[PDB]
């Protein structure tokens, strides 16, 4: 409901961008004095079509309903007269994404497990509100302080229909395939369990400290190869169906790797839910925090 008046918005730097969206940091100063609040502003590119324009409206609506300690804070909207859509004004998360953060900050296993737990809390919340995320990756997890993590982007989030257990996707070129379960790649259906597979990939990223050479696209493309034309996805699907998985990250405990493998069961019904993961991670965290 909060309206941001464009006249007090001053652009500081870009925070990120995608094919149809862009996030920039702004100081919102209705005085030009020392009370200026830092905000993250997501805008939809003016050249986006009706599909993305309606998806944007839906994305804005999704963030307005969402309220949880491990979900980025919705702040308000304002008129993007330049793009004739609204702008999503959210809180500014200071330390960035774990993808930006982890390669430069040697973080302990215990803090990593705490992040993992917090991601599950935020996700079990999203799923209780009958929404699937569809883009759960370390790049979408913002670090507030060394003990507070938040899911900070919902560009692909969708409402799970009333009499349904999954959503029909209709796959595109922007689809994060290396974070996707077999049922997503193959049957074009995204379940609540499909987000759990993606969490297993995010957990692998956390345990590799988001090292680019150890990344899911890097490791999967090494296994599939690159002379494989129009068949990266088919070859990814079949390696997953043969039981092939991302390797065990160096210094990752065997029990935690087992948990990652359990999130990556080929059979979606065999995967734990996020509500199931919370007591398990709470307990594995305490264990390594000692
Ligand atoms: C979580 C992922 C990125 C980064 N975002 C945010 N980043 C921050 N803090 C921060 C501090 N340094 N850095 C680099 C980033 N605070 C709030 C944010 F909302 C939102 C976002 N989504 C996007 O960027 C999508 C891709 C697009 F459409 F722009």
DSSP secondary structure letters along 110-155: HHHHHHHHHHHHHHHHHHHTTEE-S--SGGGEEEEETTEEEE---S
PDB experimental method = X-ray
Is residue 110 within 8 Å of residue 289, measured between CB atoms?
yes
Give the span between the Cα atoms of 214 and 71, in whole angstroms.
27
For this entry, resolution in Å reads 2.2
The owner of tokens 């995204």 is 190
The protein residue whose alpha carbon is closest to atom 3 in ligand 1 is: 16
Domains and CATH numbers, the chain: 1-92 (3.30.200.20), 93-290 (1.10.510.10)
Give the span between the Cα atoms of 114 and 144, in whole angstroms.
13
The owner of tokens 């948990």 is 259
Tell whether residue 23 is among the known ligand binding residues: yes
- Residue 272 in tokens: 């734990």
Give the span between the Cα atoms of 86 and 21, in whole angstroms.
12
Q: Is the distance from the beta carbon of residue 140 to the nearest atom of ligand 1 less than 6 Å? A: yes
Tell whether residue 142 is among the known ligand binding residues: no
Q: Is the distance from the beta carbon of residue 87 to the nearest atom of ligand 1 less than 6 Å? A: no
Residue 4's closest CA among 59, 79, 74? 79
3-state secondary structure of 243: coil
The protein residue whose alpha carbon is closest to atom 10 in ligand 1 is: 96
Is residue 25 within 8 Å of residue 13, measured between CB atoms?
yes
CA 166 to chain centre: 18
Cα of 261 from ligand 1 centre, angstroms = 29
Cα of 23 from ligand 1 centre, angstroms = 6
- Which residues, 6 or more positions from 15, have their beta carbon under 8 angstroms from its beta carbon? 23, 24, 25, 40, 96
Residue of 18, 39, 93 best suited for mutating to test ligand 1, as the one with most atoms within 8 Å of CB: 93
Q: Which residues make beta-bridge pairs with 44?
A: 21
Q: Which residues are known to be catalytic?
A: 135
Residue of 14, 15, 133 best suited for mutating to test ligand 1, as the one with most atoms within 8 Å of CB: 15
């Amino acid at each position: 409901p909060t309206v941001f008046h464009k006249r007090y918005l001053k652009k500081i730097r870009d925070l990120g961008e995608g094919h149809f969206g862009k996030v920039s940091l702004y100081c919102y100063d209705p005085t030009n004095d020392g009370t200026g609040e830092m905000v993250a502003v997501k805008a939809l590119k003016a050249d986006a079509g009706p599909q993305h324009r309606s998806g944007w409206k839906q994305e804005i609506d999704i963030l307005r309903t969402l309220y949880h300690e491990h979900i980025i804070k919705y702040k308000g909207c304002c008129e993007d007269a330049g793009a004739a859509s609204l702008q999503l004004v959210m809180e500014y998360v200071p330390l960035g994404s774990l993808r930006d953060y982890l390669p430069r900050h040697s973080i302990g296993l215990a803090q990593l497990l705490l992040f993992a737990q917090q991601i599950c809390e935020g996700m079990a919340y999203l799923h209780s509100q009958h929404y699937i995320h569809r883009d759960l990756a370390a790049r979408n997890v913002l670090l507030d302080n060394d003990r507070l993590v938040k899911i900070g982007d919902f560009g692909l989030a969708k409402a799970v229909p009333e009499g349904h257990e999954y959503y029909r996707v209709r796959e595109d070129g922007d689809s994060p395939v290396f974070w996707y379960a077999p049922e997503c790649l193959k049957e074009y259906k995204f379940y609540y369990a499909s987000d759990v597979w993606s969490f297993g990939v995010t957990l692998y990223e956390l345990l590799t400290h988001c090292d680019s050479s150890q990344s899911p696209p890097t490791k999967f493309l090494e296994l599939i190869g690159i002379a494989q034309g129009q068949m990266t996805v088919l070859r990814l699907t079949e390696l997953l169906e043969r039981g092939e998985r991302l390797p065990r990250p160096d210094k990752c405990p065997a029990e935690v790797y087992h948990l990652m493998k359990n999130c990556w069961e080929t059979e979606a019904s065999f995967r734990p839910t996020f509500e199931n993961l919370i007591p398990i991670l709470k307990t594995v965290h305490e264990k390594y925090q000692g």
